[PDB]
């Protein structure tokens, strides 16, 4: 007979354990990019010197070798980088084969096929499908996180704490991220396939899923219903008829399942910690290390001047004028990755916010914003830095407004009241870790005021 494959053993439990994907409740082969996996492939006979094997992997509806959503690679004796297959051993008709993906591979579901050239004939046969995720264990991955204990918290932990209350009195709630529960990883991959980007141009969306910046920004849009029938419909009205009270959720799992099982119709209703809880589940699943941030006295700046503006007339009466506001607290997310777009100094934590506050490029989406950038007030960089800088470090300015002459002038400044007790759960405990000093220089330093001026300088290029 011509050479043909009889069976393939994916060594699923072995490879999943090596790829730190073994925790997911799922039968599938789940792998991380840039890391080899080993399979046993039982042929009908031994390989001839006339005979060739070629593997073909593809992802998404319009695979392309140029877009790196398709790869064709021969079984060889040498690793090439890129996609490769290395023959490690022959034993009878069984081939032991080590297959490697590149660190730059797009994440998602892949199909693998084998093409055999034998006796002047050609056969092709689907071997199977796998899921490829980001690889925080791999030094050359953009999402690389070198510390073991932090990786465990920010990738592998499926229970969380979210800080709530006020700047007088901080509480906490638990949140079940549940990224390992049945179907949740599948649903989180779904989200990418339902984005406006995917609908406009699936070939390019899928090619862009090698970039955590891209995936992160997309998720920040798609977790909210606005624009795209994403996951959660916001409601701050106090009246939640025809839905759940935002406070009754205690995890992401029901929300994501209910979204799928309603035919991908917005789940009613969420507020900011519910968006953030759900976004966190998505990020951890896909392998972007992430965590949940609470900012107390969080500024909503609606006119890009880095100040919350309050108005009085010259006789001292309060004016109903201006749209700026200050939240008791607001919850968002950080994701961990390099920023090849910005440069070496701006890697690490990046703000992502799914709560629909301001349109960014026409869409309710937010981030990624370099937390380092924000602290140094480089608010000309992508993405959404002015808005986020105001959230944590707006001045609160009282204005005098003389309605006769249309003149407003500045009465007073409070440069320290915004952005207090910025909080994330501690690694490996339920302690509140304070990360205020990561977002800004210390209130009342010279640096803090220098950056504030610098930042303000860059709004006006």
């Amino acid at each position, epitope marked *: 007979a011509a050479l043909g494959v009889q069976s393939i053993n994916w060594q699923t439990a072995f490879n999943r354990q090596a790829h730190h994907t073994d925790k997911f409740s799922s039968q599938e082969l789940i792998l991380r990019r840039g890391q080899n996996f080993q399979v046993l492939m039982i042929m009908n006979k031994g390989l001839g010197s006339n005979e060739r094997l070629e593997f073909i992997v593809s992802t998404g509806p319009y695979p392309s070798e140029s877009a790196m959503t398709k790869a064709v690679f021969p079984l060889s004796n040498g690793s090439s980088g890129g996609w490769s297959a290395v023959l490690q051993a022959s034993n009878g008709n069984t081939l032991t084969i080590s297959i490697s993906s590149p660190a730059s591979a797009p994440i998602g579901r892949y199909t693998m096929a084998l093409q055999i050239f034998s006796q002047g004939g050609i056969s092709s046969v689907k071997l199977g499908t796998f899921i490829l995720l980001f690889n925080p264990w791999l030094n050359v991955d953009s999402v690389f996180m070198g510390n073991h204990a932090e990786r465990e918290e920010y990738v592998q932990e499926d229970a969380g704490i979210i800080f709530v209350g006020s700047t007088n009195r901080i509480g906490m709630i638990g949140w079940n991220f549940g990224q390992f529960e049945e179907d949740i990883l599948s649903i989180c991959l779904s989200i990418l396939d339902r984005s406006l980007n995917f609908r406009r141009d699936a070939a390019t969306d899928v090619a862009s899923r090698n970039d955590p910046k891209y995936v992160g920004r997309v998720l920040s849009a798609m977790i909210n219903s606005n624009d795209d029938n994403g996951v959660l419909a916001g409601n701050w009205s106090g009246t939640y008829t025809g839905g759940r009270d935002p406070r009754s959720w205690n995890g992401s799992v029901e929300i994501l399942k209910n979204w799928k099982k309603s035919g991908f119709s917005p789940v009613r209703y969420g507020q900011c910690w519910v968006f953030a809880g759900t976004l966190n589940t998505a990020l951890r699943s896909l392998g972007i290390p992430s965590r949940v941030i609470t900012n107390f006295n969080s500024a909503h700046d609606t006119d890009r001047n880095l100040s919350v503006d309050v108005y009085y*007339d*010259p*006789m001292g*009466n*309060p*004016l*109903d*004028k201006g749209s700026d506001s200050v939240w008791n607290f607001h919850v968002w997310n950080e994701g961990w990755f390099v920023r090849s777009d910005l440069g070496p100094s701006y890697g690490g934590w990046q703000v992502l916010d799914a709560t629909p506050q301001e349109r960014s490029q026409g869409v309710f989406q937010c981030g990624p914003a370099s937390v380092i950038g924000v602290r140094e007030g480089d608010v000309q960089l992508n993405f959404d830095m002015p808005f986020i800088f105001a959230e944590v470090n707006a001045d609160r300015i009282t204005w*005098l407004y003389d*309605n*006769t*002459t249309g*003149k407003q*002038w500045k009465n007073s400044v409070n440069s320290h009241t915004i952005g207090r007790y910025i909080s994330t759960k501690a690694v490996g405990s339920n302690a509140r870790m304070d990360v205020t000093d990561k977002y800004k220089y210390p209130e009342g330093s010279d640096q803090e005021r220098q950056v504030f001026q610098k930042a303000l300088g860059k709004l006006k290029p």
Partner: antibody
Amino acid sequence: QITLKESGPTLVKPTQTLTLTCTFSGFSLDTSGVSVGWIRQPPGKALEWLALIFWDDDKRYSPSLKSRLTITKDTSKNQVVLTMTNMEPVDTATYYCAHRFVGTLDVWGQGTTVTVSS
Amino acid sequence: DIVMTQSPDSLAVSLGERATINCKSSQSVLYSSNNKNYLAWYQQKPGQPPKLLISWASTRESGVPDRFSGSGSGTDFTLTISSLQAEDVAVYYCQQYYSLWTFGQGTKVEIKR
């Protein structure tokens, strides 16, 4: 003690520039929130607001006459100066200056008569 | 420009009697934000500059006798002299200061005798 006092030429030939001075006391035009304004009144007619200057050198003008008007201050001399170009017989009027704070124009000067004629 | 139109143009009343003056503005001078009417009344006795009687439609200035009282809101205002005195003879202007300054045309108030 808030008093304002106007001065300048009481005759101007057409096309020329009237220049009026307001000398005030009882209050500072360095105080925040304070403004002094100019108003004129053509004989047996209604009052017409001309211009206004604030403590910080912000100016306002009658929209119709803006292109012709220029208001300036000298806090050292306790003076506000009004300049009106291209004077014409219609511009014959009594000219006033007045103090403003937090309501309207609340204390006025005596007024000075200005006749436009060759 | 907001246009201030007073009425009547002239009034003659006996000593002690009530004299009323309407003023109407082309737009509303009620600022909702502070719920204040940006509307003044002045008195000009012949040969003097004008003198402010009333701000914010209804607040009397210091020293103004209580026989003077302002009412109205929005675009309709009234100055009412409760007991006309010989020396109250003057021209009364309304003025809006909601959008810059515009005056009414004036109303002459004279003693009937």
